[PDB]
């Protein structure tokens, strides 16, 4: 039915550790408006989970699709 | 091919404003391990974008699916 599309940019990735000492990568995605950026999604992924997704590098453009009962985050086409 | 599934819980929603004075809701999703929680996704959505998704309330269980070139975030079944 309805759908919203957000163009995101990966501005930051940082290695962090929980109390288990399990490693995650904190990935910050912002939207550009006007020229400023607002945060839109921050993900914390293990190194495995990132491999599964594919490349998600700083400077990459990310599509965030919001529809009824689903948010999808994909690389740009 | 490969796929990773994360069970998330919405622990927090907070009203915030960018410099445009545009309203977003900051939504924090954590994973339970052991008993502790680690952050997994933080989303900033306008009130419209949230309507499109459906209900996303504090205490709700969220599935995060990671596959090649896509992360999907859906309500629990």
Numbering used by the authors:
A (entry chain A), B (entry chain A): -1 to 32, 71 to 113
How do the authors describe this structure?
In addition, we show that crenactin interacts with two of the arcadins, arcadin-1 and arcadin-2.
